[PDB]
Amino acid sequence: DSEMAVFGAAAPYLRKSEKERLEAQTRPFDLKKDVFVPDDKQEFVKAKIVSREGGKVTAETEYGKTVTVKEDQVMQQNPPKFDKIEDMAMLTFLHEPAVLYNLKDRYGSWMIYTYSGLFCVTVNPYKWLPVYTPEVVAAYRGKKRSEAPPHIFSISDNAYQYMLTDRENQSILITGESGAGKTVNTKRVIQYFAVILEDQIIQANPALEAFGNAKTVRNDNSSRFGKFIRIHFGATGKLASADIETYLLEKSRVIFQLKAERDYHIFYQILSNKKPELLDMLLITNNPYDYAFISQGETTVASIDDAEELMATDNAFDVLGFTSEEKNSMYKLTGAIMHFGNMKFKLKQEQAEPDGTEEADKSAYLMGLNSADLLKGLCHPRVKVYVTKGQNVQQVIYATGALAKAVYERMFNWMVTRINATLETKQPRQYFIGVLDIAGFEIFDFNSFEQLCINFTNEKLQQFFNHHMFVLEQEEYKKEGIEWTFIDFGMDLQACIDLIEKPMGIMSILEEECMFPKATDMTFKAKLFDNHLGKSANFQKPRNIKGKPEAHFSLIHYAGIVDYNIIGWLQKNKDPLNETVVGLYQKSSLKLLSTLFANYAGFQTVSALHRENLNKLMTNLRSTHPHFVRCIIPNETKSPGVMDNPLVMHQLRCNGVLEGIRICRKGFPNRILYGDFRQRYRILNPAAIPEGQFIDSRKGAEKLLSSLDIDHNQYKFGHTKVFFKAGLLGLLEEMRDERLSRIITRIQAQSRGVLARMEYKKLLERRDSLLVIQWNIRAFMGVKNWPWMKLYFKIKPLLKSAEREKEMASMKEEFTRLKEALEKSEARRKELEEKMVSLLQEKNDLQLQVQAEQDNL
Amino acid sequence: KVGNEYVTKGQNVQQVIYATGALAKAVYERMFNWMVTRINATLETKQPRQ
Ligand SMILES: Nc1ncnc2c1ncn2[C@@H]1O[C@H](COP(=O)(O)OP(=O)(O)O)[C@@H](O)[C@H]1O
Ligand SMILES: [Mg+2]
């Protein structure tokens, strides 16, 4: 249990226990006696095998109920060896009940992360589990998904491994219904990147979170804008400058909030009174109920304490390096917006007469200008012929709301730009990894233009997933000359997108009527009905319900039918403003309001910008190698552990995960280039593909594979990329690692051999020296025991041998010293000779240089 | 590389074939110049005096 010991706390929550699988193998089972049968309230139920009368197999459900049904919707249960399987591609039987029941089995053990073929699926646990510890992140470093339990950390690690190996961009895309957990997983991915500037990226997400998210019926932490976070890396394979891009912040939230929907987080974080200094300098109490814009929602969430969120976002701002002046500026603007919300107006003979201007004075003080000028601009708007115009009392409130939402949007863009500036670093950055977290699909009780935009973004993301996973993979199979029948998996959302995105479509008619002045909801809607009602499968008449608000029409996304009541979408897409107040805000005292807002009058519909951003984003994405994560919400009640079968079945059908797993298990998932394969797996059979003795790719790769003694029917050789059947690539990697280990061990053995060889040669020389010494000392003792030898042999060398024998020693040593001196002198003379040759070389070079200056003149 | 970002450029067949030709020209010119430098180094022996 090496993985268990390494993981520690998160081990039981990520990997099945050894005893658990041991008892699972002992669970009673058979090829027969096991089936899944459909049911109404629960989609599928386990059942036994009783009798097949006329082909009508009889099944006794686990609840005890017994019913006979024909061979249709009769699917064999998978063997218990596949219970709580980490990757769901090795299922011998694949069928709609099987995916649900394996997912539920893993969910019961709180195993949210599961691999469905190539991409990953995450079920919402609705409870923060101890799996995101930095120890687990370190354990998830440099590990394949096969050798590690499923987790988003493993997904990020595999993306980084591709990043390093193939030197190509990666894009981790999170897709699912709202509140499924996309933002949490994006935060975990950013955390994994930070662990392996890091504090800057960590705290940047809460900074935008505090201003973007709001509490909704579907989820309390509901993002109102798409996020694309790009982390750049250099050639060395280390983190570098980052970037964050936002998509279509829902500006209508400030003006209006639904009955069960709260407002933005910051408007109540500041009013939580955690820092009364904020209350003092903003001239605002801690009760949002006195303030019209932010009092429509509950302003209270059971799981959210706005004081903690406020201190967290302040800490994040400090970590990012936000100066106190700009923080105070945005705080003053946030105060000013509900100060504007406090505005009241009355008709008196025609422009509304201002009243209750004290709050207007306070707001003007916060932003910085003459309050009378702003009041007159709101009271008597002047626009391009600056000409005054009579307008209704109700219109001044709408104008103030539009100005407030525009100011909030500009402040949001300023935060985005400041985050980019803080994160940007001049250090080299080679490639990038893009994490995509769009606003998830959602079905509110009443839906409007922003809901339509969010759902259209979700539709386009699902269509991109379908196109890449199904169409492009099959076209790649075809192009490389691989025999493969074309299979249609049954989802092509291009028609649904073209219903609105393409010209003359519902969204296109929306921009066309927005350009058209005097545009009314009644007529424009008519322009929709005669255009696509009936003839378009998705669009249809509104399936109006008495409980739900009246809807103009109903249209079918990939996730189901949704009603879309249009109420003044033309003004929302057009975004009109009063030019007088525009001019007043342009020259405001505050740095933020003056710089940001000056480009409004310094048009293009926001829907057109949304479409262009989606097109550009997905064209950029197509250049990358996506990793998909699909998030499933188990229960609408936010109850952890409740695994509501019909909802998950509907989500699985809309997502089309089953067909993705089918195309992963049937087709060839792994495709590797011939040259890359040769240079990578040559260690398996180095004899094949001899080192630099020929030039050919296909033949060498074919010989290498044919020498690998595996199932040769798995791979179909192509023109440029050899394909691999599912599970083959990991096997080849396993034998490659084993062969590398064998090579390293043999290298160690050879190194030990040579070290022993040299040390034993040294031992030989030492033994020869010892023999010489011992023989000489033996002779010396033999001559020393002789009384004669010492007398004439100890004084002769000093005296008698000095004059005519030791003088040979003296002349020899002086010859040696003189020879050393002569050799050193001759070597010095030779090096001086070559040095003076070099001096000639450089002097003629310098005369050439002199000629060069005479050329210069 | 534009700025600090390595942006991949998309070119048609004409540009890529012209690039191949330019690479061939440049590498052969460097070939010729390296040959000239090599022969100059071999011939430029000691005592290039006077
Ligand atoms: N992996 C997870 N661990 C713990 N809670 C999670 C996880 N994923 C989602 N949740 C919870 O689910 C809810 C919605 O998750 P969130 O990421 O905010 O969704 P969305 O991306 O749709 O805004 C929150 O209550 C969040 O805490
Ligand atoms: Mg979210």
CSV table of N, CA and C in Angstrom, one decimal, chain A residues 232 241 425-430 833-834 836-837 840-841 844, chain B residues 1-8 44-50:
chain,number,residue,atom,x,y,z
A,232,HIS,N,1.5,30.9,-18.1
A,232,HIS,CA,2.6,30.7,-19.1
A,232,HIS,C,3.8,30.1,-18.4
A,241,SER,N,4.7,34.4,-16.1
A,241,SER,CA,3.7,35.4,-16.1
A,241,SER,C,2.3,34.7,-16.4
A,425,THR,N,5.2,39.5,-15.7
A,425,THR,CA,6.6,39.5,-15.3
A,425,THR,C,7.4,39.3,-16.6
A,426,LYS,N,8.5,40.1,-16.7
A,426,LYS,CA,9.3,40.1,-17.9
A,426,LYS,C,10.1,38.8,-18.1
A,427,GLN,N,10.1,37.9,-17.2
A,427,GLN,CA,10.8,36.6,-17.4
A,427,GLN,C,10.3,35.8,-18.6
A,428,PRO,N,11.1,35.1,-19.3
A,428,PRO,CA,10.7,34.4,-20.5
A,428,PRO,C,9.6,33.4,-20.2
A,429,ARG,N,8.6,33.4,-21.2
A,429,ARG,CA,7.5,32.5,-21.1
A,429,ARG,C,7.3,31.9,-22.5
A,430,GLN,N,7.4,30.6,-22.7
A,430,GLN,CA,7.4,29.9,-24.0
A,430,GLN,C,6.0,29.5,-24.4
A,833,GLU,N,58.2,32.1,-28.3
A,833,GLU,CA,58.2,32.1,-29.8
A,833,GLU,C,56.8,32.1,-30.3
A,834,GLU,N,56.0,31.2,-29.8
A,834,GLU,CA,54.6,31.2,-30.3
A,834,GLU,C,53.8,32.4,-29.9
A,836,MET,N,55.2,35.5,-29.7
A,836,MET,CA,55.6,36.5,-30.6
A,836,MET,C,55.0,36.3,-32.0
A,837,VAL,N,54.8,35.0,-32.4
A,837,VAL,CA,54.0,34.7,-33.6
A,837,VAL,C,52.6,35.3,-33.5
A,840,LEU,N,52.6,38.9,-33.9
A,840,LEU,CA,52.6,39.3,-35.4
A,840,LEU,C,51.2,39.2,-35.9
A,841,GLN,N,50.5,38.1,-35.5
A,841,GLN,CA,49.1,37.9,-36.0
A,841,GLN,C,48.3,39.1,-35.6
A,844,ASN,N,49.4,42.5,-37.5
A,844,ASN,CA,48.9,42.6,-38.9
A,844,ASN,C,47.4,42.8,-38.9
B,1,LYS,N,8.6,35.2,-32.1
B,1,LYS,CA,8.3,35.8,-30.8
B,1,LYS,C,8.0,37.3,-31.0
B,2,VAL,N,6.8,37.7,-30.6
B,2,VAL,CA,6.4,39.1,-30.5
B,2,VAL,C,6.2,39.5,-29.1
B,3,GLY,N,6.8,40.6,-28.7
B,3,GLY,CA,6.9,40.9,-27.3
B,3,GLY,C,7.7,39.8,-26.5
B,4,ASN,N,7.0,39.3,-25.5
B,4,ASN,CA,7.5,38.2,-24.8
B,4,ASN,C,6.7,36.9,-25.0
B,5,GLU,N,5.9,36.9,-26.1
B,5,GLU,CA,5.0,35.7,-26.4
B,5,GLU,C,5.5,35.1,-27.7
B,6,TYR,N,5.6,33.8,-27.7
B,6,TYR,CA,6.0,33.1,-28.9
B,6,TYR,C,4.8,32.7,-29.7
B,7,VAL,N,4.4,33.5,-30.6
B,7,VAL,CA,3.1,33.3,-31.4
B,7,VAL,C,3.5,32.6,-32.6
B,8,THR,N,2.8,31.5,-32.9
B,8,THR,CA,3.0,30.7,-34.1
B,8,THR,C,2.4,31.4,-35.3
B,44,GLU,N,47.4,30.2,-43.4
B,44,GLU,CA,48.0,31.2,-42.6
B,44,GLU,C,48.8,30.5,-41.5
B,45,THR,N,50.0,30.0,-41.9
B,45,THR,CA,50.9,29.4,-41.0
B,45,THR,C,51.7,30.4,-40.2
B,46,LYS,N,52.8,30.0,-39.6
B,46,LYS,CA,53.6,30.9,-38.8
B,46,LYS,C,54.3,31.9,-39.7
B,47,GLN,N,55.0,32.9,-39.1
B,47,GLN,CA,55.8,33.9,-39.7
B,47,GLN,C,55.2,34.5,-41.0
B,48,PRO,N,53.9,35.1,-40.9
B,48,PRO,CA,53.4,35.9,-42.1
B,48,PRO,C,53.9,37.3,-42.1
B,49,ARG,N,55.3,37.4,-42.1
B,49,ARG,CA,55.9,38.6,-41.9
B,49,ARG,C,56.0,39.4,-43.2
B,50,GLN,N,56.5,40.7,-43.1
B,50,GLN,CA,56.9,41.5,-44.2
B,50,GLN,C,55.8,41.8,-45.2
